[PDB]
Amino acid sequence: MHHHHHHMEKKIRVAINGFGRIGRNFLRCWHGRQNTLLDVVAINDSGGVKQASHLLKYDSTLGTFAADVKIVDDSHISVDGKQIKIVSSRDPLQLPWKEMNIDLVIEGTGVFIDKVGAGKHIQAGASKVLITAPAKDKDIPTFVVGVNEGDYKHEYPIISNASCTTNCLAPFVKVLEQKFGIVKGTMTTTHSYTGDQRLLDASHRDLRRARAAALNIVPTTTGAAKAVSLVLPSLKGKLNGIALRVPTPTVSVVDLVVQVEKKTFAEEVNAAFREAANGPMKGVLHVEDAPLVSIDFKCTDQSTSIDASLTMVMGDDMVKVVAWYDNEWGYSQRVVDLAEVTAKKWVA
Amino acid sequence: KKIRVAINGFGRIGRNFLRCWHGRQNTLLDVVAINDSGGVKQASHLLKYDSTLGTFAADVKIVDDSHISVDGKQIKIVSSRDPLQLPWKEMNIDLVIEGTGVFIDKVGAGKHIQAGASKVLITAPAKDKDIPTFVVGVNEGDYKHEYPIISNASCTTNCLAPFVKVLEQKFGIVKGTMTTTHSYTGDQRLLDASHRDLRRARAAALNIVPTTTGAAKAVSLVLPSLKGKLNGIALRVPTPTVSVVDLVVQVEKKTFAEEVNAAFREAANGPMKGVLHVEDAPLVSIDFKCTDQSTSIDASLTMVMGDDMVKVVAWYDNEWGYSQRVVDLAEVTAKKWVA
Amino acid sequence: MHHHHHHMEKKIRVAINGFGRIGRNFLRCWHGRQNTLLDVVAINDSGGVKQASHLLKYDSTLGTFAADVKIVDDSHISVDGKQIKIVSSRDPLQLPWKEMNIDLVIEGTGVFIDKVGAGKHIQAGASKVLITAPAKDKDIPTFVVGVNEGDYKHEYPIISNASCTTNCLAPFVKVLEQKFGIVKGTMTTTHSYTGDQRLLDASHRDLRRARAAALNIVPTTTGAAKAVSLVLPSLKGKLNGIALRVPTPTVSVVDLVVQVEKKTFAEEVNAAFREAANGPMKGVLHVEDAPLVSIDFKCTDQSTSIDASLTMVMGDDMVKVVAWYDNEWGYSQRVVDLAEVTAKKWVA
Amino acid sequence: KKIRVAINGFGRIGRNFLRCWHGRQNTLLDVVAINDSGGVKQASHLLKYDSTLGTFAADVKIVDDSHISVDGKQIKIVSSRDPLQLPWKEMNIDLVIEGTGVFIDKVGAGKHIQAGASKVLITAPAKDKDIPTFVVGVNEGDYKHEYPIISNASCTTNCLAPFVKVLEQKFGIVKGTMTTTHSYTGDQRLLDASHRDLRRARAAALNIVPTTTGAAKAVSLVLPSLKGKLNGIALRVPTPTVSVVDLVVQVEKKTFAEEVNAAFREAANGPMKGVLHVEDAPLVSIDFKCTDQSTSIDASLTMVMGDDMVKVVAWYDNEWGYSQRVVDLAEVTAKKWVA
Ligand SMILES: NC(=O)C1=CN([C@@H]2O[C@H](COP(=O)(O)OP(=O)(O)OC[C@H]3O[C@@H](n4cnc5c(N)ncnc54)[C@H](OP(=O)(O)O)[C@@H]3O)[C@@H](O)[C@H]2O)C=CC1
Ligand SMILES: NC(=O)C1=CN([C@@H]2O[C@H](COP(=O)(O)OP(=O)(O)OC[C@H]3O[C@@H](n4cnc5c(N)ncnc54)[C@H](OP(=O)(O)O)[C@@H]3O)[C@@H](O)[C@H]2O)C=CC1
Ligand SMILES: NC(=O)C1=CN([C@@H]2O[C@H](COP(=O)(O)OP(=O)(O)OC[C@H]3O[C@@H](n4cnc5c(N)ncnc54)[C@H](OP(=O)(O)O)[C@@H]3O)[C@@H](O)[C@H]2O)C=CC1
Ligand SMILES: NC(=O)C1=CN([C@@H]2O[C@H](COP(=O)(O)OP(=O)(O)OC[C@H]3O[C@@H](n4cnc5c(N)ncnc54)[C@H](OP(=O)(O)O)[C@@H]3O)[C@@H](O)[C@H]2O)C=CC1
Description:
The structure is a homotetramer. Chain A is α/β, with parallel strands linked by helices. Chain A is 24% helix and 26% strand. In chain A, helix 4 (164-179) crosses helix 5 and helix 4 (164-179) crosses helix 6. Chains in contact: A-B, A-C, A-D, B-C, B-D, C-D. The complex binds NADPH dihydro-nicotinamide-adenine-dinucleotide phosphate (NDP) (4 copies). One NADPH dihydro-nicotinamide-adenine-dinucleotide phosphate (NDP) binds next to helix 1 of chain C. Chains A, C: It is found in: Plastid, Chloroplast. Chains A, C: Pfam families: Gp_dh_C (PF02800), Gp_dh_N (PF00044).
């Protein structure tokens, strides 16, 4: 009944450093949101407007972008008329983030993942950096939306959104820990290949990731099960696992085997997941009842799809859970989500 | 002294079996007949040329309308969908290798004996429970000549049972679960199409495809102390051969990875030599193609959590390694042959 | 200025026999049309409502159907509330087409492709059969939309929509013949694998199609270049070719080399194609100027996409043209189109 | 009598070259040095284990921090991105096999001679026109010891030139076009990523990928009568090795398929024995893996339209068959070695 303006949440100015699989999935995820607090104003692409526009528009995994993608001039593209600056520097110290008034950098290079490296963006003028990967520094806080994003504070200048596998695992591990308690467990992710692997046998520090990715099942170490304890500290020292990279281009599946404290059975485990999916983890955790295969989970927005018919309990307290995740697109929706959290908590 | 063998079902396992047999230094098996509905043209061609085994180095020829020859040795080719119609009495067949995936129960496999064979070796789990099952390196000393129909189990049970036997002896298994990440097989569809299993209906080279497995339960057929202790699942993936078992077990004796691996090495160097291998190099699936062992423990992947949760990862060539076990089990029947 | 009703074009009652790749692509193509003269009332699926609904909804090539797919009862599914009968007979003589008042059968089995076999549907009660494949009988008329569908007559009870490759070739061959004249030519299609090939080396009358399809380049004979003369009779005896099946699941590309009568150059050839694309072959023939790869042509509605930068002319009169086609989806749009022609010409 | 060889670039061609050389009965080549930036660990491992060639049967060992051994024969491993820094004077290197794809022009390849080598053989088309190009079976009799830098052309030109030589001799080529349906190579990306060529940027195992080829024009370097007569394109497809050339030519002499094939058989049985093969069996790409010839005409695919339009389809293992030609051309330099 009073004289007032309308509430304005402020949009933060975002730059994407590294316009790779995750950088380009992030842009399409953002562009498809009905409402956003993010204004993407800059992209660092070594190939300039030609490469940025082409690889944004045409995608072997996602299909052709329905949006109108145009080259505006020699340093701008537009997406449905919204212009975005293209910069091209390998050294973040050289990026114009002070001049462009950048609030948040999405670090999707896989290169600047510790405080010194990501901090170069802040030295260059940005206020905050969100690393799309596990941090290389123990003191960089890590967040998984659906698990611990309420512990985010505006006063963290550098943050990590963890790995795709940790974003799959941690929501349903949180449910297991809440309902049944975890003693210890192991995980194997059967994971699509990524650009870190080689197309044909070739140079790599990892002699297994050196091997032809579309021809092989390729074991590789993973920090993702240990990393769950960065977001669920009660799980410190309780989980470990491995990865098997296989000849698919996206979608992965986690197989977790945990010993729980409370004796249970498969229907009760699934009921705990369904309760979470319908409530506090809606949009992050899904329980799938149809008999599907990996490609059915392409471009799904949730972090975790429990394959309900595969849930198994052995000897009362050994619980096996199988969960699908689109390691590109679902993970990128979580990057958008965590960037939106930083916008919501931005301090005046 | 040698026994006369017919192969029924000249598919992936039937053809791997012939090439495995042909490469043996010494054998008590005389392969004399192959039932292939494509006749000499198809049998000769797919024996010689193989997308995963490569070209057979033997000279493969079409002799006449019902014989091929392999390095000069003639094999009769027959073509009947009905085993009752096969000439096994005429040809004095001792042993039928059942590689069709169809005649896997006691009535079905028994048709070969009705047609005149003496014994049938099913290259698969049997459907009914009174057909004895054997895994070479685990319980083949329990085979008896009086068994007219026997099973060599599945590829996954042949990989699992040898190293589960070691774990049970050394540490004691309380319970466990397994996943096999498994190459696609001919039961799955190339593009989405009719299948009684709606996941196996889906394009095999495009997908990770979950499917049931009987292999964790089947271990208890050859290792009775494992009754009720294991369960698991398969994930079929877009590779054409070589598979990998990931087993997680709770054990009685608290342990650590090096000690688990040491138990496997003792077995690989002794009583399971040739069946169980421990691999120390950092390899990938294709490196285990055409390996003769049933199981290759990937040593650097062994993990122990909380003292008594043991994770073991083991590779197996589900075509070639399994078919070497089929040859081995058939050789056992020859050694114990009486009548 | 007079008392009148509105014009009513009649919808023909359609049954799909063989709910395979082409049968299911046909249903989705039809369902996505803004306006149609086709009412799909029956599907013959050996697996009943469970298999028909599941494989309609979930598709490894097309992705998940956005439409609401439900099992209504033991012999009906619904798509966005529209109910469709599921029948399951291997012998078309046994299908209930008289009882269901079927106008047109889409024959997508690959089995009933000559007059006796397709004619079993007419004996069963249908009025017309459209074979989604080359006919096995020389006297069954063949049509390619964009080429000769004006020669269709209601009085043909059995018709063929030719093969996917002939639907790619014939529109742009028609342009070449019109503008430059064809002396003779050869073609190779580099073609996705199909369900006729084997997953691992296994039984087949064709010893090359016996071989593992996702591991190999697989030569196979093709009638598709000769078949162009069924729709363009001036080309009788002038074309032949081969197929190479490769490890992709859909989209194919035709490489045609023709000797022409009129001396020409690449830009002039492409200009003839662009004139056709913009005019009489709009929606059937497309000229693509971007540097794309096979998966960019997935789910494209045209029959033919000329890769303009690959057009080459050697020695004045040897013309090489490269054209992309989605052998499942584009072909199925042409099946819908040819069925719509039969509806338009239906005689009162 | 033997010449001392260094391999610069231990990639697919560098490693195929070593295995091809090692399998020769007789050789005038002594491979003494390999430049691999991953050192002995990487060079030994990727030489032993290979996703398309399979495991090397030779004993491969790490001797010390700068030597491996292959069946006991030691090879020095060096690691410099800059050829000027390589120890070729110290090691008395005669011939460098340039397998990097980088030092393919006269300045770049010349750095190995500046560093002390006498001769460089580029395993690729050269970038500038005064580097002589040779295809074994076509023009290697034109090689001269006085040429310090030579090219062995591309895999596609090695497949094309031998049978184009036969067509030109027997029928006369007026003009023609070619497409190669070619396995992916390491220049392409695994998933969509940066590339100067926006089609080679795209996921290689998911796509048919058009790309330019110099091979049809390059035939005129080794066969001057072909100047200006051919053009063509490549389609990269999701297979890891083996490729196929489809050539369509207008010829002078009217002919028919059996006569074209007969010309190829005459050449395969005579002056191109070992380089050109004519295949009569109905095979697929994997059957031509690890074949030693440069070209396998698929006889049943030869087609003649309108009397003078000839279509020929020829298979080639773009890794192994090409590397056997690299070995052959290096052996020619050894036979003609003076100083
Ligand atoms: N793919 C996945 O499934 C997931 C990946 N991640 C993580 O996301 C990050 C990126 O992975 P992904 O997108 O797959 O890899 P890509 O290789 O596709 O993307 C990496 C991008 O960074 C660019 N880049 C590299 N170095 C620099 C530099 N110095 N300056 C500017 N741009 C640079 C590359 O371009 P150029 O070619 O110009 O170097 C490329 O565009 C990694 O940390 C990865 O671990 C996280 C979750 C899931
Ligand atoms: N592939 C693997 O990894 C393993 C498979 N197995 C088991 O081995 C068996 C065969 O498997 P695989 O070789 O992969 O399958 P394939 O489909 O390759 O071989 C099956 C063979 O049986 C033939 N066949 C089918 N029905 C009949 C019949 N009525 N009379 C005669 N021949 C017939 C088929 O020929 P046609 O085309 O003429 O029907 C084909 O040659 C199955 O039981 C399978 O579970 C066991 C371990 C591993
Ligand atoms: N795929 C392609 O790219 C193109 C294919 N075509 C043509 O379309 C036709 C179908 O090809 P495609 O869809 O790929 O093959 P599919 O194998 O996917 O579909 C064949 C369908 O017919 C069913 N079927 C077979 N026999 C019978 C029968 N007696 N009664 C009822 N249903 C039956 C099969 O089901 P079941 O498993 O129950 O037998 C299956 O659903 C073929 O003629 C093909 O040449 C044309 C253009 C392009
Ligand atoms: N593969 C094929 O089918 C054929 C390829 N070729 C030609 O052969 C050459 C190599 O091709 P391929 O073997 O496929 O490619 P690879 O990428 O497999 O091998 C290239 C090798 O060169 C090394 N290398 C690159 N730069 C340097 C450098 N500055 N100093 C030292 N080593 C270096 C790479 O190691 P690092 O990772 O350390 O850079 C890698 O080992 C190219 O010219 C190609 O066109 C010819 C015929 C056929």
